[PDB]
Design a protein around this ligand. Structure first.
Ligand SMILES: Nc1ncnc2c1ncn2[C@@H]1O[C@H](COS(=O)(=O)NC(=O)c2ccccc2[N+](=O)[O-])[C@@H](O)[C@H]1O
Length: 521
């Protein structure tokens, strides 16, 4: 499985310093294979590490019997369910590298992922609108003929993922890919018209988990509510569910971050850490103001907030109104994660997005033409390090633009750095809407909009929104009367995720040739 390797001297350095340990990610789970302590709670169901590890072996073995081989790829679509983890470790034990699509993703995204990786295996959920029946499947399996095996959650027929999980593995020996090879693909937020895959090796990903575990001080006491989409990197590895597993703690799954669901789960299971995006924080604080008892949250000791910028105002309300500590988390699927620390001053936790997890994360600030700016100045975030990728999957064209000659990746973020070394996110350069933490590549939606018979020109831009931070607005130059609901129906027909439908549509007589900078003015 081809990907952009680190130069040999970076690998060597990163091994000498102890960052790359050459262990497979399966070791996160198998070190606890003998443990009957609880690893995952999902509704009424509670799976121990022993059971979780056996479930991954069973599924891996069953897939091996059905002909899946090491070095092949898979497409996985599972929400906040225990079977997400069973599947991730089962594929890791076989040396198969998955994309974990989010439940919210639809045809265009699944098609895009399948087209790039040519999965031999599709695993999905009949609860998803696309898979309750068999029509889409037939089309998907026809148009992506690489697929030989389909397993489905909540299925009673021949393709029931449970039957595979429940079938005891006879004589199963794991064959994880080598540690310096690809373990899995992450999804980028998106800055272009087609989605970009981020290969993650075992060395690089395990280090990001292990080190996030030291910084967040996770242990067997950790009881972690995973309420945001479980397959996103923030939920998975920063320190996420995998850091919880590493530490031997417990992951509590929630379908969504609503107070309605989560306040009760936090009290019931005595949750002590969770991860949210800013709007979920506001909604929580407002639920308390509408009279939810603060005591449901007593056991909470650490609340991470990331995905998008937390305002200082909102941040300060966390210790005050919830009474746990805040940790700001500014990371990216491509790699780099900055954290505020648990012993940082209130000033740094409230007003900054922390600093890199690794001492050899290298971060500088560039001006418009690639030159370093002195500290305090606002510019483009440039970075490289032991867990930051060196290229997107099969993307020579885009890769040429995304990295400088020295291997530094530009995140598209505008930042400034403190005298103390802390980073503050000041804005953005990449053509991306950050809708309450969820990323929308504007070019993707614009291209879809231009396919409408009536749309001549199209621009998608963010607009300030108090709850979500940013909402999306589509500015269109049109031939004929066009209402928002027509645009949304149409985009939905193209088969994209709901959060990607414009919150607002506006027909305008003209747009500048599209020069969005001009448009903002
Ligand atoms: N804390 C933050 N403040 C302002 N912007 C933030 C932020 N955290 C993430 N972002 C933005 O989100 C982009 C990364 O997008 S992402 O691939 O969906 N990943 C994440 O947001 C993320 C957030 C926290 C922890 C881990 C990740 N992650 O690597 O998945 C960054 O380049 C920023 O533009």
């Amino acid at each position: 499985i081809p990907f952009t390797r680190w130069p040999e001297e970076f690998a060597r350095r990163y091994r000498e310093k102890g960052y790359w340990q050459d262990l497979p990610l399966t070791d996160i789970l198998t070190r606890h294979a003998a443990s009957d302590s609880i690893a995952v709670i999902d509704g009424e169901r509670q799976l121990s590490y022993r059971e979780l590890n056996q479930a991954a072996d069973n599924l891996a073995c069953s897939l091996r019997r059905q002909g899946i081989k090491p070095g092949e790829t898979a497409l996985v679509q599972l929400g906040n369910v225990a079977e997400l983890y069973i599947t991730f470790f089962a594929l890791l034990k076989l040396g198969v590298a998955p994309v974990l699509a989010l439940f919210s993703h639809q045809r265009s995204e699944l098609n895009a992922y399948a087209s790039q990786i040519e999965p031999a295996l599709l695993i999905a959920d009949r609860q998803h609108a696309l898979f309750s029946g068999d029509d889409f499947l037939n089309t998907f399996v026809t148009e992506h003929s690489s697929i030989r095996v389909v397993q489905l959650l909540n299925d009673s027929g021949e393709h029931n993922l449970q039957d595979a999980i429940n079938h005891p593995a006879e004589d199963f020996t794991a064959t994880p890919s080598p540690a310096d090879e690809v373990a899995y693909f992450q999804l980028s937020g998106g800055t272009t018209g087609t989605p970009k895959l981020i290969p993650r090796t075992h060395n690089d990903y395990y280090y990001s988990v292990r080190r996030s575990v030291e910084i967040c001080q996770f242990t067997q006491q950790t009881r972690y509510l995973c309420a945001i989409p479980a397959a996103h990197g923030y939920a998975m590895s920063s320190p996420g569910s995998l850091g919880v597993f590493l530490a031997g703690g417990t992951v509590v799954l929630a379908a969504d971050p609503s107070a309605t669901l989560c306040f009760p789960l936090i009290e019931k299971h005595q949750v002590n850490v969770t991860a949210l995006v800013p709007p979920a924080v506001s909604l929580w604080l407002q639920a308390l103001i509408e009279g939810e008892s603060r005591a449901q949250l007593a056991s909470l000791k650490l609340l991470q907030v990331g995905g998008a910028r937390l305002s200082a105002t909102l941040a300060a309300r966390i210790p005050a109104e919830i009474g746990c500590q805040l940790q700001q988390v500014f990371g990216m699927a491509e790699g780099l994660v900055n954290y505020t620390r648990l012993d940082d001053s209130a000033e740094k936790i409230i007003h900054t997005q922390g600093y890199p997890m690794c001492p050899d994360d290298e971060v500088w600030v560039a001006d418009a033409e690639g030159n370093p700016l002195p500290q305090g100045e606002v510019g483009r975030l440039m970075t490289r390090g032991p867990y930051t990728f060196r290229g997107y999957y099969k993307s020579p064209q885009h890769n040429a633009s995304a990295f400088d000659a020295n291997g530094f990746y530009c995140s598209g973020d505008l930042i400034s750095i403190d005298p103390e070394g802390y980073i503050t996110v000041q804005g953005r350069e990449k053509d991306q809407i950050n809708r309450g933490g969820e990323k929308i590549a504007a070019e993707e939606i614009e291209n879809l909009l231009l396919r409408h018979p009536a749309v001549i020109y199209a621009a998608l831009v963010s607009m300030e929104d108090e709850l979500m931070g940013e909402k999306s607005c589509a500015y269109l130059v049109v031939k004929e009367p066009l209402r928002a609901v027509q645009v949304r129906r149409f985009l939905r027909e193209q088969g994209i995720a709901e959060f990607k439908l414009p919150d607002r549509v506006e027909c305008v007589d003209s747009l500048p040739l599209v020069d969005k900078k001009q448009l903002r003015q």
